[PDB]
């Protein structure tokens with residue numbers, strides 16, 4: 001079945017995943033070096049073995065393409081994936097004047113009442129980002145996140161480079177180019193930023209009139225992250241294909257450190273006892289073509305009949 | 317056998333390699349997305365099915381580690397791999413006053429007498445690089461080549477960053493880090509340089525006290541290039557392992573566009589009918605440890621009993 005590579009990867013780190021300790025103090029089972037191939041012509045690879053929220057993926061991806069670095073847009077679409085970082089920033093800001101909030105991720109998970117103070121303080125912040133233009137510009141701006149990295153790579157000579165916009169014109173004019181690469185890995189910022197990008201670099205390849213994309217992902221959360229990671233780059237693949245009047249080949253996913261947090265073994269095992277279903281079918285708006293000006297309504301998912309979602313603790 | 321992954325990759329692009337046209341006007345058979353795993357504990361992966369020159373690899377690698385960008389060092393060790401680029405540069409230089417020399421790669425290959433003028437003019441240049449300090453500094457300096465990219469990545473604030481030197485200290489202090497990445501892909505220079513790096517980015521991974529490395533290679537010459545490409549990164553892997561008092565795991569080779577030039581089909585087919593042999597054993601100098609100060613004599617290859625070399629035309 002289409003998602004089988006995913007189930008086969010989860011399966012394997014259960015068999016050969018040696019125990020690896022890590023940054024987030026929650027143990028992991030790890031493997032290094034892996035590759036998955038998805039034929040995007042068989043269907044859209046949104047896992048059917050567990051409900052995964054397309055909405056979060058769609059808004060987030062668009063956010064990237066727009067060249068956005070501001071949380072505001074996401075909240076504006078009920079997307080709270082990136083909040084934690086914009087919050088962490090304001091909480092350190094001297095202007096912040098409230099409860100201790102230190103290590104809030106760890107502390108909330110281990111304290112029912114602290115998690116209460118946290119969520120109230122957060123809702124506050126998110127509203128302030130949404131309403132205070134100045135506040136937004138100050139704390140709603142992540143800065144060095146994919147959208148900037150893809151669409152505005154700052155040079156040494158001050159100027160900015162729209163990698164992704166140049167790679168698409170390079171594909172329109174030189175499909176057969178072996179240098180259709182886009183990178184999110186800047187040696188200059190990498191040691192200072194909080195979360196160096198997970199999806200280090202991706203590459204395009206056009207042959208037979210079909211476009212495929214390879215993604216290099218240095219680190220990976222098998223249960224909570226890969227399911228999304230997949231549909232984010234498989235969606236990008238159609239989006240570029242649509243823009244370039246091209247077909248759709250494969251989404252090839254290469255991993256560096258693929259891992260399974262110890263606190264997710266029972267969850268992965270249950271999902272593993274599930275039996276896949278036919279894949280959902282992606283439908284992009286025919287008329288509209290320049291993908292950067294796309295909005296939620298232009299990408300339509302069909303026939304997604306998932307299994308019930310599976311809840312699990314995060315690693316922090 | 318150890319090199320079997322290599323023979324299995326060459327084999328496959330013969331079966332499924334669709335025809336892809338390219339920059340070097342010589343047709344290719346191509347595949348996109350592939351991965352090979354080599355257990356460096358079984359032996360050093362220098363192909364036994366065809367003599368490959370370790371000397372060229374060893375000098376070149378050291379050249380990289382030294383942070384060198386100057387051709388002089390290589391010539392000084394009879395290594396002429398990079399000449400063509402330093403030559404191309406001088407030939408365009410107004411100071412150059414000799415024969416037409418345009419498209420010399422194509423023109424020499426297709427003209428016995430032109431190739432004569434070329435080789436005489438080249439020997440000249442190489443000597444001038446070796447003897448004229450000023451000439452060397454001016455034309456013997458490639459500038460943006462791995463050695464600089466690895467060991468001196470220019471920032472926007474002028475300063476330089478020794479990625480590789482920082483990654484090794486990061487491994488000495490944080491083996492279990494999922495961010496031990498080194499990149500040669502700079503979005504800022506990439507569109508101007510002649511040959512954007514082939515070996516885009518590599519990553520380290522330490523587990524069980526064994527160090528492994530994954531390399532992402534966007535483009536690849538299966539017959540003439542991969543054989544080298546392999547021993548260059550498998551050697552780097554021991555070199556870092558030695559420096560860090562670590563063991564040796566696997567060398568994982570992930571490819572983007574792997575290809576076989578049409579003008580090499582008979583050559584690859586003959587090699588394919590060869591039967592591998594036990595692998596050569598790499599012996600690094602026990603006393604010496606800081607790999608950056610290494611010299612040819614510190615790395616010793618053993619038991620390399622190759623088949624006769626196989627000559628073939630290059631692609632230009």
Ligand SMILES: Nc1ccn([C@H]2C[C@H](O)[C@@H](COP(=O)(O)O)O2)c(=O)n1
Nearest residue numbers: 023198219220221225226228494495
């Ligand atoms: N969509 C996501 C979000 C996060 N991660 C995870 C993987 C690691 O758990 C951490 C990234 O690695 P590091 O901790 O070294 O920064 O983030 C992931 O794979 N996919």
Ligand SMILES: Nc1ccn([C@H]2C[C@H](O)[C@@H](COP(=O)(O)O)O2)c(=O)n1
Nearest residue numbers: 178179339514535536537541542544
């Ligand atoms: N050691 C080497 C030297 C060269 N190449 C080849 C692969 C391609 O033929 C070209 C690089 O890609 P591009 O032409 O897109 O720059 O150089 C390679 O694989 N290995």
